[PDB]
Amino acid sequence: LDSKVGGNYNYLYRLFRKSNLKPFERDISTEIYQAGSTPCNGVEGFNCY
Amino acid sequence: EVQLVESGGGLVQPGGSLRLSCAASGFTFSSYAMHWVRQAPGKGLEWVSAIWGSGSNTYYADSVKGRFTISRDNSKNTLYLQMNSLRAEDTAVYYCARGRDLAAFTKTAFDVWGQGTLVTVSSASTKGPSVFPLAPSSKSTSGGTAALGCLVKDYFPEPVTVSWNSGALTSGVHTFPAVLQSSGLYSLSSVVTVPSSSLGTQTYICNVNHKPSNTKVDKRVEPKS
Amino acid sequence: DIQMTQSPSSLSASVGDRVTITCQASQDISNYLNWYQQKPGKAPKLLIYDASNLETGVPSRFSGSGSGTDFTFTISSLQPEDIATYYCQQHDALPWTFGQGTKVEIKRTVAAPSVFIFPPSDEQLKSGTASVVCLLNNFYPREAKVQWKVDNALQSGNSQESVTEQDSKDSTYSLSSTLTLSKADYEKHKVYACEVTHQGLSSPVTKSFNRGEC
Amino acid sequence: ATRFASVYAWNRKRISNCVADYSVLYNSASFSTFKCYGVSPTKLNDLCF
């Protein structure tokens, strides 16, 4: 079912969050997490994924 | 209210480049997936590309793989579409649509569908229209109705609007879709159905307006002989 | 890719009739298929998503069904604003493909067309162009045959046609046929005529004209 | 390095018995890419090798 010829990709996993999740927490925000001192300000640039 | 106002379309020679814009307002732009879909003139829908938020998970249709580049924007919240190495087969109206495939597995469809922008890949240059009347036969006895119209020829690009007698005569106005000629310039005909007995008494003036060229023409039709 | 043999390509039904448009699949795409309603000059509008769930803000007379590799689709009550072309779009495997589309129009009573011919205007002659237009007005069905005759010779390859979409008021179509020739060729022939064949006419109707009003 | 080594002779400098401060190089914007596998770049200041 979930293995499509051509590439299933409809499924995502949060990769860069700030802190560890609480039990049974559901996080849906998609804000750009800053991977560095320089703030992202949304800009998906360097140190921003 | 969701609003996908599209812009950036226009006339490009083959092999050129053009950037389309799709502004968004009324919803969280950074949390939705955006797509581009185009439709050839008179043909069916064909998907173009999709970007699911990240600046690396971009996917394109097989017919545009390598040539088209998709990109988005934060802050002001707009969507962009880079077009390279265009061919004559690339002429189509491009739409930007929505999508919440991210989390929602129910509204997988394209929730909104912007109004679209027209992109024409051609080396022809912009040119204003020439207008010619469509005269009837004076000895027509086939019926009490005579057909009259005005032929708007060789305009580029769309659209046009047709009025009659400054709005005082609107009965039976019929505007036909434009067609493309072998000369590379478009053609359109607008006609009106009227009683035959009013040809020689009432003055029939057709009004043609073209927004991209701001041209307005008034022509009167009189029976021959 | 995923191919759809959407059939029939076009079908005729009357007001209130039940409409079914089939949309196939390739490999058990379950319910990852969407339906779209499109009007001329207008952007597509969602009709059925996930093959069963109606969109919000849509009147309840629209409904969808089917799953897997066959999708039935059912219309309950035709409304005069429902005239459009409908497209089924697969959204499973890296969604790329749409459907070819089926044009759904209102069935009506056969109506004979009005045939007329337009000689070139004098204002058009000083520009160097002559256009001969034949009008096919208010006919149904859309099937019509145009036979251009110049000097009793059947013409071909020198005429262009144009068909209006389904009208909002009477759901009837209009057609325009345009014949083009130069002014030099205009002086070299005498008889210009267009012939229209239609279901509402027992025999085709011919409208003729002679240059110079002869 | 005034001059970098060639790929046909890439250089291998052995670094040991020192404190490696990666925050200046991490914050430095002069690098085009900085990809770390296994550990996140912000915990290298605590970890030891």
Side-chain angles (χ1 to χ4, degrees), chain A, chain B, chain C, chain D residues 1-2 4-5 7-49:
Chain A
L1 279 72
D2 285 329
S3 298
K4 65 176 72 174
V5 294
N8 199 234
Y9 62 111
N10 63 6
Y11 293 160
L12 291 174
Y13 60 88
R14 173 171 299 261
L15 184 61
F16 297 120
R17 174 171 212 288
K18 330 269 191 203
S19 92
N20 266 341
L21 292 174
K22 304 193 328 299
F24 300 132
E25 195 278 333
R26 185 175 177 268
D27 192 356
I28 193 66
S29 64
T30 61
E31 301 268 0
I32 303 299
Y33 162 67
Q34 65 200 40
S37 137
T38 45
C40 295
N41 323 297
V43 182
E44 324 181 40
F46 181 59
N47 287 354
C48 292
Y49 274 110
Chain B
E1 65 207 9
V2 63
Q3 272 298 73
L4 285 192
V5 298
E6 312 187 44
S7 64
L11 307 177
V12 291
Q13 298 214 326
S17 65
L18 189 53
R19 298 183 70 250
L20 305 187
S21 288
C22 172
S25 287
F27 74 104
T28 315
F29 183 68
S30 51
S31 65
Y32 276 88
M34 294 302 172
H35 296 213
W36 285 98
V37 178
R38 74 179 177 187
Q39 178 162 42
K43 206 44 54 193
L45 277 297
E46 70 177 89
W47 176 64
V48 176
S49 64
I51 179 155
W52 286 3
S54 300
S56 57
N57 63 6
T58 74
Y59 294 100
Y60 315 96
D62 193 62
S63 309
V64 298
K65 284 175 71 175
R67 310 192 290 115
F68 282 15
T69 301
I70 193 170
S71 165
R72 305 184 75 231
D73 156 70
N74 63 6
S75 48
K76 189 176 180 180
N77 299 333
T78 55
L79 176 73
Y80 303 111
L81 183 62
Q82 178 71 49
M83 294 182 183
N84 196 348
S85 88
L86 293 156
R87 304 304 153 209
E89 39 178 359
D90 286 32
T91 70
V93 174
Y94 290 77
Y95 302 91
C96 57
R98 208 194 71 195
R100 181 65 179 270
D101 185 277
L102 271 181
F105 278 28
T106 48
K107 297 290 185 180
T108 63
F110 296 104
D111 184 283
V112 58
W113 273 94
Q115 82 278 0
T117 65
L118 176 63
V119 176
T120 314
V121 176
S122 71
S123 282
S125 287
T126 297
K127 184 185 167 305
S130 296
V131 293
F132 314 119
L134 294 180
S137 165
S138 294
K139 196 66 178 176
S140 164
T141 61
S142 52
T145 303
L148 271 54
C150 295
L151 177 65
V152 184
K153 273 287 193 68
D154 291 331
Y155 69 93
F156 183 24
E158 294 84 3
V160 65
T161 59
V162 186
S163 51
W164 274 82
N165 279 334
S166 307
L169 180 49
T170 310
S171 177
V173 163
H174 294 308
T175 306
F176 292 164
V179 300
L180 73 165
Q181 313 167 99
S182 296
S183 60
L185 309 184
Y186 295 87
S187 164
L188 174 143
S189 82
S190 179
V191 305
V192 61
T193 184
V194 295
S196 296
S197 300
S198 72
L199 290 179
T201 299
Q202 180 60 219
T203 52
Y204 285 9
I205 297 168
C206 83
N207 312 118
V208 178
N209 184 9
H210 182 241
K211 312 317 298 203
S213 62
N214 195 17
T215 297
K216 295 191 73 172
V217 185
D218 299 331
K219 323 178 277 292
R220 186 265 318 258
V221 179
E222 185 65 23
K224 306 191 285 185
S225 173
Chain C
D1 285 27
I2 310 303
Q3 283 64 10
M4 321 305 178
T5 308
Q6 163 181 3
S7 63
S9 288
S10 193
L11 60 87
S12 182
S14 308
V15 163
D17 286 1
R18 173 264 321 159
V19 177
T20 60
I21 283 170
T22 62
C23 180
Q24 291 148 232
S26 287
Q27 62 184 175
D28 55 22
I29 66 158
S30 183
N31 61 4
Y32 273 128
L33 189 148
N34 178 7
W35 283 77
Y36 283 113
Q37 180 195 70
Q38 323 174 259
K39 297 172 131 75
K42 317 314 170 53
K45 212 62 71 183
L46 306 88
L47 183 62
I48 289 286
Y49 64 98
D50 276 298
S52 179
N53 292 319
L54 184 55
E55 293 82 3
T56 61
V58 180
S60 296
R61 59 220 170 190
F62 276 110
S63 179
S65 71
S67 67
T69 187
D70 294 283
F71 299 82
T72 311
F73 182 76
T74 49
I75 301 314
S76 58
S77 174
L78 197 59
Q79 214 54 49
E81 64 268 17
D82 295 348
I83 54 190
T85 304
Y86 295 86
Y87 273 54
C88 72
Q89 187 274 332
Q90 180 262 11
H91 208 92
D92 201 7
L94 183 62
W96 43 70
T97 184
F98 278 77
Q100 301 78 9
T102 299
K103 175 161 291 323
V104 73
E105 79 284 351
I106 297 169
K107 173 80 149 296
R108 295 183 68 253
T109 296
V110 172
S114 298
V115 187
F116 182 76
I117 192 170
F118 308 89
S121 66
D122 72 358
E123 181 193 341
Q124 187 185 201
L125 291 182
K126 34 172 151 173
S127 80
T129 296
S131 178
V132 177
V133 176
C134 192
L135 163 62
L136 281 72
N137 214 307
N138 299 339
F139 61 94
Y140 185 84
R142 265 192 142 172
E143 178 164 323
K145 178 203 188 59
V146 175
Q147 282 180 318
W148 279 97
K149 77 177 189 44
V150 181
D151 290 327
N152 199 2
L154 184 65
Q155 304 299 293
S156 66
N158 49 8
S159 55
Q160 295 188 284
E161 302 181 347
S162 176
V163 176
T164 310
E165 292 290 86
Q166 188 176 184
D167 191 88
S168 61
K169 184 292 174 174
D170 49 13
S171 293
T172 309
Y173 312 81
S174 284
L175 185 156
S176 65
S177 296
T178 299
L179 177 83
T180 303
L181 73 164
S182 64
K183 168 181 183 168
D185 304 331
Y186 176 75
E187 302 297 338
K188 286 170 181 184
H189 303 97
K190 189 185 151 174
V191 180
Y192 313 130
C194 61
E195 184 185 353
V196 177
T197 310
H198 190 271
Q199 177 168 334
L201 299 171
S202 308
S203 295
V205 165
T206 301
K207 292 293 180 190
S208 179
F209 184 71
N210 299 331
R211 44 139 300 160
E213 193 163 323
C214 168
Chain D
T2 318
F4 263 62
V7 61
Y8 84 106
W10 47 270
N11 263 324
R12 178 163 286 265
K13 192 154 181 269
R14 291 189 54 272
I15 288 303
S16 66
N17 299 310
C18 63
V19 293
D21 47 351
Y22 300 99
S23 66
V24 294
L25 57 84
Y26 184 69
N27 283 339
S28 73
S30 56
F31 302 149
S32 293
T33 78
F34 192 110
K35 195 70 65 66
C36 283
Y37 301 130
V39 176
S40 82
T42 70
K43 294 183 188 293
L44 279 66
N45 303 320
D46 309 65
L47 201 58
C48 304
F49 309 90

